[PDB]
Amino acid sequence: RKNIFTGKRLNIFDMSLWDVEFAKQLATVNEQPLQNGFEELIQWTKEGKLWEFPINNEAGFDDDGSEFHEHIFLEKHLESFPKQGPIRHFMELVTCGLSKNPYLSVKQKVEHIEWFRNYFNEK
Amino acid sequence: ADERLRINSLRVKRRWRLSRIVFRHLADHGQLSGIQRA
Amino acid sequence: CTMIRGMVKHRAYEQALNLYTELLNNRLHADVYTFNALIEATVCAINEKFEEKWSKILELLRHMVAQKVKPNLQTFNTILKCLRRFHVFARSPALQVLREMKAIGIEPSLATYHHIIRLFDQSFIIYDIMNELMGKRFSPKDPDDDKFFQSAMSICSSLRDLEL
Amino acid sequence: LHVDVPKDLTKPVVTISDEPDILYKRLSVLVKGHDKAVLDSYEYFAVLAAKELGISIKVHEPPRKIERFTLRVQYEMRTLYRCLELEHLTGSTADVYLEYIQRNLPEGVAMEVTKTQLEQLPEHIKEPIW
């Protein structure tokens, strides 16, 4: 007349690929077919096939964690160029043009500046 | 693209990407979205 | 450890026991999963009666505590699955295993109740199991968990109880 | 389901963070379509959802646009509009409402959501530098 969780016990205690496959076959015990459309949408969202809502038009894009000062102030890369000549004028204009380019990353702008540096160095 | 631009700086139904005949064929069938002939 | 687990998986039980013996001879320690595999091998060894096999399981468990290795859910589930093979003689040991597993602080899984129910269905323990499990939400912990409900339903068919 | 019903259901976990919520003065949802009936049905849907979620909504119809082009064989494209201004809604309410109505956006209809967040002056601008 007593519940099965009371009685004699052992009393002996007191308080790689193997793991990967173990977890994979744990995944199976709760592997049932989709039961309706909402579950299908949830499954695809978890898989990442579906867009996130509300739509963020810049989702998955962070521009390498760049800051605005790295895009708008690009004149620090013109230090190795002439400081008061006509090349200074042309490069100031070029960096003004690059700083107003929203389609380019900072890396592309700096490599443009470096190409100009190299071309003038050869000449 | 960048290389050719740098030197330069110092100095038909293409709207839908279809052949002009084909665009008529598609649009007559109603296939294109919102292209209603008037 | 991996060599023992491999041999047990591919049914080289005697070889697994031997490699465990040179494992001990090398003063090396075995992990939990290897102890589960050795339990499987001990029960699957041929030509031994229930009492000797049960004593050997207890001896492996004594070695496991001697090596400071703590059991997990898989150890007790393996013990119960192994123990299913010994029909009526195994019922009181099965209760003792479940009570020990509860006492140590390991929570029961669906596979545990599945194995116990299938051991006894060969029957009022199902009422106690349901009384414990009513209202509880489960998570995947053992490969045999999915086999619980089926087995439980079979019991409800054999006892002819609709409320259960 | 007359007898077999789910006994309990997993409500999703919505935790009340400590970070203060965004505040939107206005939220203009301009929906564009080739069909006026789809836009009317979507207007009914969005308005009903807005009334039930407590959001204040006002609807109007911006003027239709026409793109006419000849290849003689002449083709035409219609763009009809419906603008839904929500007012005085917080960040979470706006986000959930937008998720709902954008997941339920009918075929061939695009959306342009303009959000006007309310913010305070930066502390740098409260007084001049000395």
Side-chain angles (χ1 to χ4, degrees):
Chain A
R1 299 192 165 197
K2 274 74 178 173
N3 189 358
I4 54 157
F5 318 124
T6 76
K8 60 98 173 183
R9 71 193 206 85
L10 294 170
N11 292 111
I12 299 165
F13 318 86
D14 284 330
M15 294 299 291
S16 73
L17 183 63
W18 286 97
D19 179 318
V20 166
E21 295 291 329
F22 186 68
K24 181 266 289 181
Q25 63 84 30
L26 276 296
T28 297
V29 294
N30 280 29
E31 184 64 23
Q32 290 299 299
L34 71 167
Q35 64 155 20
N36 60 4
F38 284 121
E39 292 290 325
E40 191 178 68
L41 301 166
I42 289 156
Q43 190 268 335
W44 281 348
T45 299
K46 291 167 170 176
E47 294 293 328
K49 290 183 174 71
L50 283 171
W51 288 352
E52 73 284 343
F53 287 79
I55 301 299
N56 172 33
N57 294 101
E58 317 292 25
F61 176 61
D62 187 73
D63 205 338
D64 316 312
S66 293
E67 305 271 344
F68 78 95
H69 58 81
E70 309 179 17
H71 287 273
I72 196 73
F73 311 124
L74 299 161
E75 69 275 16
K76 181 266 290 180
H77 310 99
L78 299 180
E79 295 293 327
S80 304
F81 293 78
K83 294 181 176 68
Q84 282 159 27
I87 297 89
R88 176 51 83 232
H89 186 273
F90 201 106
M91 294 298 102
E92 178 62 23
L93 195 164
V94 162
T95 183
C96 292
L98 294 174
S99 57
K100 310 158 67 183
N101 210 325
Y103 310 137
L104 291 171
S105 62
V106 180
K107 304 295 288 182
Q108 294 170 60
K109 299 175 189 199
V110 298
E111 61 85 19
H112 288 304
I113 297 164
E114 291 291 327
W115 183 98
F116 283 112
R117 203 164 64 83
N118 305 296
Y119 177 82
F120 292 166
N121 268 28
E122 299 310 289
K123 269 66 187 177
Chain B
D2 50 340
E3 190 277 331
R4 67 185 68 188
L5 159 60
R6 281 148 177 158
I7 295 89
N8 277 270
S9 66
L10 295 169
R11 296 290 186 270
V12 67
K13 294 293 104 175
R14 76 284 193 192
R15 170 165 184 193
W16 289 274
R17 197 202 290 296
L18 277 299
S19 173
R20 62 96 174 172
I21 298 98
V22 175
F23 172 93
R24 294 179 72 250
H25 195 81
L26 284 169
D28 300 322
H29 287 77
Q31 284 201 268
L32 287 168
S33 48
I35 303 293
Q36 81 192 9
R37 68 187 210 164
Chain C
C1 283
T2 300
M3 187 66 203
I4 291 164
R5 284 177 297 191
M7 293 183 286
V8 170
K9 183 179 183 184
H10 303 291
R11 309 185 179 204
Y13 305 125
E14 206 274 1
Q15 293 82 17
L17 292 169
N18 292 339
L19 196 65
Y20 175 50
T21 60
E22 305 61 45
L23 180 65
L24 294 174
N25 292 338
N26 199 359
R27 284 85 175 91
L28 292 177
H29 299 82
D31 65 5
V32 179
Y33 292 165
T34 47
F35 274 111
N36 302 352
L38 294 174
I39 288 160
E40 182 65 26
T42 45
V43 299
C44 294
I46 309 175
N47 296 328
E48 294 178 6
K49 197 255 181 185
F50 154 68
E51 287 296 329
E52 290 81 2
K53 291 186 174 191
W54 171 87
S55 186
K56 285 180 177 191
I57 301 299
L58 292 179
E59 183 178 1
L60 283 171
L61 188 153
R62 290 143 38 194
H63 293 194
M64 182 179 72
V65 292
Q67 291 180 37
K68 304 180 184 162
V69 181
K70 182 175 73 175
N72 59 6
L73 171 64
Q74 293 82 17
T75 311
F76 293 98
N77 264 335
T78 305
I79 291 161
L80 289 165
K81 178 184 176 192
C82 278
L83 187 153
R84 186 268 186 189
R85 295 179 66 250
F86 301 108
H87 57 275
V88 179
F89 293 100
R91 288 175 177 166
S92 171
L95 277 296
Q96 181 177 2
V97 167
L98 176 152
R99 279 184 298 231
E100 178 71 23
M101 183 278 288
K102 181 172 177 182
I104 302 159
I106 298 95
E107 289 107 325
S109 64
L110 289 178
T112 318
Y113 297 112
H114 160 64
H115 293 323
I116 289 170
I117 289 159
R118 177 156 180 85
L119 166 65
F120 282 54
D121 179 45
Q122 297 199 340
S123 302
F124 296 125
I125 62 170
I126 192 67
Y127 292 165
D128 292 340
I129 292 169
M130 283 319 325
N131 278 334
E132 186 188 32
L133 291 178
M134 175 190 263
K136 185 167 78 173
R137 298 189 191 214
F138 317 132
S139 48
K141 292 180 187 175
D142 188 293
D144 294 332
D145 288 332
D146 76 326
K147 291 163 191 170
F148 167 78
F149 285 95
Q150 175 185 313
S151 303
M153 203 69 243
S154 191
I155 313 316
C156 298
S157 188
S158 73
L159 282 71
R160 295 179 66 250
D161 190 324
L162 175 69
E163 299 298 328
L164 188 68
Chain D
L1 292 169
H2 321 318
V3 62
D4 179 7
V5 297
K7 190 177 181 182
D8 293 80
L9 288 80
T10 61
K11 295 183 289 295
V13 181
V14 178
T15 65
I16 297 164
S17 307
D18 56 20
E19 198 275 326
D21 211 349
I22 292 158
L23 297 173
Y24 292 116
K25 184 175 74 175
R26 292 183 291 113
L27 195 150
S28 169
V29 184
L30 181 71
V31 292
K32 315 176 63 137
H34 294 280
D35 186 75
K36 187 177 185 295
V38 177
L39 297 167
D40 291 331
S41 293
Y42 195 49
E43 167 186 340
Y44 177 69
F45 164 72
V47 169
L48 181 55
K51 313 215 169 301
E52 183 178 1
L53 289 163
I55 309 157
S56 178
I57 179 152
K58 294 181 176 67
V59 62
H60 74 260
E61 181 172 3
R64 61 192 291 275
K65 185 177 180 180
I66 299 294
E67 291 81 3
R68 184 177 175 180
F69 63 92
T70 187
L71 302 178
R72 185 175 177 87
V73 176
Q74 185 71 258
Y75 286 93
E76 189 273 322
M77 182 179 72
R78 297 203 175 188
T79 308
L80 320 181
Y81 296 85
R82 203 60 43 74
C83 195
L84 300 172
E85 293 82 3
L86 303 175
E87 293 174 68
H88 306 319
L89 71 168
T90 64
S92 289
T93 308
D95 186 74
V96 65
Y97 178 89
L98 280 174
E99 173 163 4
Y100 188 45
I101 64 149
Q102 293 189 319
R103 277 190 177 283
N104 294 299
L105 196 65
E107 295 294 328
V109 171
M111 185 180 288
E112 305 183 356
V113 184
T114 307
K115 311 170 275 216
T116 297
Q117 177 173 357
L118 287 170
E119 282 204 332
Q120 297 172 346
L121 291 171
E123 61 87 21
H124 296 285
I125 316 306
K126 278 181 181 186
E127 65 279 17
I129 53 163
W130 294 286

